[PDB]
Structure 1
């Protein structure tokens, strides 16, 4: 990685291809190639399941080369994956969207502790509790 001047964390997908049009955001007042991105991700795509947008950064070095920062499909889209109900954001308190058990996130928190980095696997569970209610979820065992 490098400084936060060649920092945009991005890439909703890899099969939608070009990360320059609407699908792939950013690519503004920065300057870098676009097809020079997904080829290293082509050796990296087939471990991630689709429907799970993974955050990676266009980190450009000082010598024009750029690869990504492998993360992990995160909190938000796994509750659209492991529960089975998508974004719907705005209503945590109006009508019931879905309740999630305690252990349903902990089994994928070991996968998500390679996505989220504060300290630990258990410690990142209460921020999977975060964006779920912003999507509109409720959580109780």
Structure 2
């Protein structure tokens, strides 16, 4: 499972299963029934909030069979949403753009506690600041 015969990590929109500029060609362009995947990845989608990126490393086999294994939505995106911005720093990063509550961030680790191996949950949020600080915005934490 964890070891792949030829895996393909790839960020992908929640709202689609068969685009092309995003994915299809992207899959290593190597043996994938896109007709399957479109019934595949979109099936998960109803549970998830739509229009947004989701990491989902894929696991190809010489069998041509595979088990795509969706993770959880990226931390870097969820900050911007509460921030309400449609993009990044826009202005150079050293100067601020966004804003965040101290209660914000704190559940962000809980949203992604799986990927986040951080022991203390409060400690886990320290990492979240990097997601925040690269945006350069001043969290009200």
Fold conserved (TM > 0.5)? yes
Contact 1:59 1:66 in 2 (8 A): yes
SS at match of 2:129: helix
3-state secondary structure, aligned to 1:25: coil
1:113–1:120 CA contact under 8 A, matched in 2: no
| 1:30 Cα offset (Å) | 4.3
User: How large is the Cα RMSD of the aligned pairs?
Assistant: 2.9
Task: Rate the CA distance shift 1:136–1:58 in 2: closer, same or farther, 3 A.
Answer: same
Distance 2:90 2:30 in 1: 32
* TM-fit CA distance, 1:112: 1.3
Deviation at 1:25, TM superposition (A): 7.0
SS at match of 1:40: helix
2:101, 2:139 within 8 Å by CA — same for their partners in 1? Answer: yes
Give 1:45 shift. 0.7
Q: Give the drift of 1:125.
A: 1.6
Cα offsets for 1:109-130 (capped at 9, x unmatched): 2111134345564343222212
List alignment gaps of at least 5 residues for structure 1. none
In 1, Cα distance between equivalents of 2:117 and 2:62: 26
Deviation (angstroms), 1:2: 4.5
Q: Compute the TM-score of the two structures, normalised by the length of structure 2.
A: 0.75
Paired residue total: 141
Verify: 1:93 aligned to 2:93, yes or no: yes
Cα distance change, pair 129–28 in 1 and its aligned pair in 2 (3 A): same
Change (3 A) 1:128 1:28: same
Identify unmatched segments of 5+ residues in structure 2.
none
Q: What is the distance in 1 between the residues matched to 2:56 and 2:21?
A: 17
- My pick for the range that moved more, 91-100 or 74-83, is 91-100
Mark the CA change 1:119 to 1:55 in structure 2 (over 3 Å): closer, same or farther. Answer: farther
CA deviation after TM superposition for structure 1 residue 24, in Å: 6.3
Take 2:42 and 2:18, find their aligned partners in 1: how far apart are those partners? 13
